[PDB]
Amino acid sequence: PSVFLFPPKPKDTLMISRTPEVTCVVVDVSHEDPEVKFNWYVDGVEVHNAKTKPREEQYNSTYRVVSVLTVLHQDWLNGKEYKCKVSNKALPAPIEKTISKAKGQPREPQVYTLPPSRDELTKNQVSLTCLVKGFYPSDIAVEWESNGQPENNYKATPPVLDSDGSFFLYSKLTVDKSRWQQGNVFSCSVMHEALHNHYTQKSLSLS
Amino acid sequence: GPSVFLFPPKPKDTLMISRTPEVTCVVVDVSHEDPEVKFNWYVDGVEVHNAKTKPREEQYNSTYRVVSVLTVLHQDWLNGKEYKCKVSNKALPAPIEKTISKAKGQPREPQVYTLPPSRDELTKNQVSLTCLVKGFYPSDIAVEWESNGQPENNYKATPPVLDSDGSFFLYSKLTVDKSRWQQGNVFSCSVMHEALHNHYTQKSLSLSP
Ligand SMILES: *[C@@H]1O[C@H](CO)[C@@H](O[C@@H]2O[C@H](CO)[C@@H](O[C@@H]3O[C@H](CO[C@H]4O[C@H](CO[C@H]5O[C@H](CO)[C@@H](O)[C@H](O)[C@@H]5O[C@H]5O[C@H](CO)[C@@H](O)[C@H](O)[C@@H]5O)[C@@H](O)[C@H](O[C@H]5O[C@H](CO)[C@@H](O)[C@H](O)[C@@H]5O)[C@@H]4O)[C@@H](O)[C@H](O[C@H]4O[C@H](CO)[C@@H](O)[C@H](O)[C@@H]4O[C@H]4O[C@H](CO)[C@@H](O)[C@H](O)[C@@H]4O)[C@@H]3O)[C@H](O)[C@H]2NC(C)=O)[C@H](O)[C@H]1NC(C)=O
Numbered sequence: 001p002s003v004f005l006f007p008p009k010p011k012d013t014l015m016i017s018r019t020p021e022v023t024c025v026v027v028d029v030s031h032e033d034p035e036v037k038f039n040w041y042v043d044g045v046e047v048h049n050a051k052t053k054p055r056e057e058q059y060n061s062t063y064r065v066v067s068v069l070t071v072l073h074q075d076w077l078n079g080k081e082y083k084c085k086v087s088n089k090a091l092p093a094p095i096e097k098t099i100s101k102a103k104g105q106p107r108e109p110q111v112y113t114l115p116p117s118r119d120e121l122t123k124n125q126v127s128l129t130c131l132v133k134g135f136y137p138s139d140i141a142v143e144w145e146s147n148g149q150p151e152n153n154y155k156a157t158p159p160v161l162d163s164d165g166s167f168f169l170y171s172k173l174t175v176d177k178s179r180w181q182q183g184n185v186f187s188c189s190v191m192h193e194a195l196h197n198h199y200t201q202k203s204l205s206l207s
Numbered sequence: 208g209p210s211v212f213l214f215p216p217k218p219k220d221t222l223m224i225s226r227t228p229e230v231t232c233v234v235v236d237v238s239h240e241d242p243e244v245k246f247n248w249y250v251d252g253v254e255v256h257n258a259k260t261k262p263r264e265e266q267y268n269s270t271y272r273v274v275s276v277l278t279v280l281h282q283d284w285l286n287g288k289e290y291k292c293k294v295s296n297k298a299l300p301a302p303i304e305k306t307i308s309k310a311k312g313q314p315r316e317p318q319v320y321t322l323p324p325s326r327d328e329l330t331k332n333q334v335s336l337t338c339l340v341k342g343f344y345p346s347d348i349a350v351e352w353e354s355n356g357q358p359e360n361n362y363k364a365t366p367p368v369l370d371s372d373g374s375f376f377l378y379s380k381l382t383v384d385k386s387r388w389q390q391g392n393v394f395s396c397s398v399m400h401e402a403l404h405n406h407y408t409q410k411s412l413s414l415s416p
């Protein structure tokens with residue numbers, strides 16, 4: 001029986017309207033010993049608000065059991081540690097796992113929208129690029145939209161370590177050439193702890 | 208006990224005829240007492256006799272490490288031939304065999320596009336010159352920057368990323384002093400990939416006053 005502990009999603013911790021959660025997932029729980037007990041601690045102090053799922057049988061004949069703790073946005077961002085302790089009768093000592101935000105001094109992202117290269121205008125679809133650089137830690141959300149609605153066809157690269165020890169990434173949005181040439185506006189919005197109000201937005205249009 | 212690792216050539220070694228692509232078979236945790244290792248090599252089942260093994264390197268836990276390098280024809284690797292390394296030893300029951308070959312899949316030509324820095328970046332000491340490379344398959348690729356026929360190395364590239372059509376893209380960011388950009392220097396983004404004519408293409412980027 002193994003334990004895997006998951007941090008909340010970055011967008012959820014950066015935005016007070018959303019609800020950040022840490023998730024403790026226990027796998028390889030047997031039929032022979034099918035009950036699990038969780039104990040949840042924030043900075044070593046036991047908490048009691050966790051919601052545990054009823055166990056679910058997998059295709060491989062084992063059980064999956066999941067416990068979810070809601071965390072306060074500011075506790076996560078302030079580096080508090082979350083411990084999930086799991087007990088089972090086929091376990092000599094219970095497994096403990098501990099998670100918290102990436103350590104290190106935060107650096108603020110610099111966001112740059114780059115139009116498509118002149119050479120790409122011969123194609124039916126063009127590439128609008130969002131350079132997000134100079135940020136730390138790596139946890140970040142970068143999204144594209146137009147007229148306040150999420151754009152369909154894009155992908156970000158993973159964050160990459162830069163020479164100064166900060167991170168960068170690129171997000172590529174693909175749009176029909178006509179939509180660009182008709183002069184529609186597109187915006188890359190970025191969320192990160194080091195941004196004022198955890199949010200900045202940069203637009204990009206043909207002119 | 209004894210393990211074997213089989214490594215492939217560096218993409219660009221295979222992509223330029225002047226360079227020497229190698230398949231490298233490394234053997235580790237060879238016993239202190241009965242060490243002698245023999246290397247057999249095969250290309251599509253057919254034995255080849257030009258591998259250059261190095262004498263054993265004794266470690267600091269009474270274990271030997273014995274590397275063996277096989278030079279490979281460029282066009283063989285690109286044409287999907289299979290390279291088998293066979294390592295035998297007295298302390299093995301069966302000799303260990305490992306096989307390796309190029310990533311499969313229909314090749315697709317990368318498209319290459321240089322993007323200048325956003326005007327919002329010109330308030331900084333250093334600016335970002337960007338090369339987008341998309342539509343390529345397989346992911347094996349080399350991207351490099353230069354100026355005035357000297358390599359320009361203050362750049363980092365992203366990993367290849369699977370795009371929404373099965374092809375890969377990546378970006379490579381070059382960082383240069385703002386002054387160098389403002390003065391009209393040409394920077395170029397070299398791309399090397401099996402699906403490009405002559406395995407090479409190059410795109411340039413300069414300031415427009
Ligand atoms: C019966 O069925 C059961 C049910 O299926 C089955 O259970 C399964 O068991 C296996 C192992 O036994 C479990 O495997 C584990 O999976 C974990 C979760 O993996 C996923 O998430 C990872 C992280 O994702 C974030 O981060 C990535 C990079 O950092 C990003 O790429 C992601 O996008 C994502 O980012 C997002 O979140 C960030 C915050 O986290 C945020 O910043 C960011 O912005 C963004 O929002 C991914 O890495 C991972 O992807 C892997 O797999 C896919 C293919 O599916 C590949 O394409 C990827 O490249 C990658 O390889 C998943 O999406 C893992 O964390 C866990 O890893 C650890 O354990 C393994 C060995 O098991 C180690 O090799 C590994 O190194 C990790 O351990 C290390 O650290 C610990 C301590 O920290 C250390 O002790 C250890 O020694 C080691 O160093 C592992 O792989 C699987 O989860 C179970 N499934 C389920 C459904 O529960 C069961 O086994 C079956 N029974 C059998 C087989 O008998």
Ligand SMILES: *[C@@H]1O[C@H](CO)[C@@H](O[C@@H]2O[C@H](CO)[C@@H](O[C@@H]3O[C@H](CO)[C@@H](O)[C@H](O)[C@@H]3O)[C@H](O)[C@H]2NC(C)=O)[C@H](O)[C@H]1NC(C)=O
Nearest residue numbers: 210211212213214233234235236266267268269270271272
């Ligand atoms: C005794 O000492 C030597 C040297 O420290 C150890 O050799 C090392 O063995 C590890 C374990 O397999 C090798 O790891 C391999 O690394 C490559 C990276 O390219 C990876 O692709 C492989 O999958 C694997 O993880 C490692 O290369 C090797 N070190 C060296 C310098 O060659 C050995 O394990 C030790 N033996 C013990 C502790 O019993």
